[PDB]
């Protein structure tokens, strides 16, 4: 569960999410017709007053059995068009992002650890 206004912990090479400040970015919106978020769900996130679209990859809520259960709610920054902003994600992403149809392959082009 990554609802609205959950303190997100971005993991991307992009400095947009690395500018230090006491405002850890909090999710603005979730595009599931319900306001609960899960793996690989487009959300709107606020970073230093800037709105952006983001991809949930790993969260603390225990989902299906054979996917991981991370510590804090990791997200990936994606520009409005769809090009992912970062180029190196330090933390690992689940494989389960690959399953269904949708705009999820282009963020598989960064993961150094398909855990």
């Amino acid at each position: 569960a990554i609802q609205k206004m959950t303190r997100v912990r971005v993991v991307d090479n992009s400095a947009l999410g690395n500018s230090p400040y006491h405002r850890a970015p909090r999710c603005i919106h979730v595009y599931k017709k319900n306001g609960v978020g899960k793996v690989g769900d487009q959300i709107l996130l606020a970073i230093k007053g800037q709105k952006k679209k983001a991809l949930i990859v790993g969260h603390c809520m225990p989902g299906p059995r054979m996917t991981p259960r991370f510590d804090s709610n990791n997200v990936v920054l994606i520009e409005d068009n769809g090009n992912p902003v970062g180029t190196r994600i330090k933390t690992p992403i689940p494989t389960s992002l690959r399953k269904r149809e949708g705009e999820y392959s282009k963020v598989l082009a960064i993961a150094q650890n398909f855990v």
């Binding site: 068009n81 180029t87 190196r88 690959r98 392959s105 282009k106 082009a109 960064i110």
Partner: protein, 111 residues
Amino acid sequence: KFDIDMMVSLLRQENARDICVIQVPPEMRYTDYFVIVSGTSTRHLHAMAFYVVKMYKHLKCKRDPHVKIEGKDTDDWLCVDFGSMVIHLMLPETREIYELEKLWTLRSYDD
């Protein structure tokens, strides 16, 4: 069969500005092969992607889930996921700033 060889033949006859492949070792769970390709402009990427996906659809692999052209809306970076293969069409500058094959080689050795 719609293996890599026929794909690169289609790319060569269409004359994409660059073609290249990277192999996925079986100890990585992503896919079997990662074909980095680059055409001239977004129209060229559109046309070559449409031709290759249509040939794949008609020739074989009817009893499996269909194939989606990732990122056609975005005019610079496209992807397609096959059963074992995955192919990525790159803009020149986008390819440079990303440098995917570097990571695929230096998975845990360079930033």
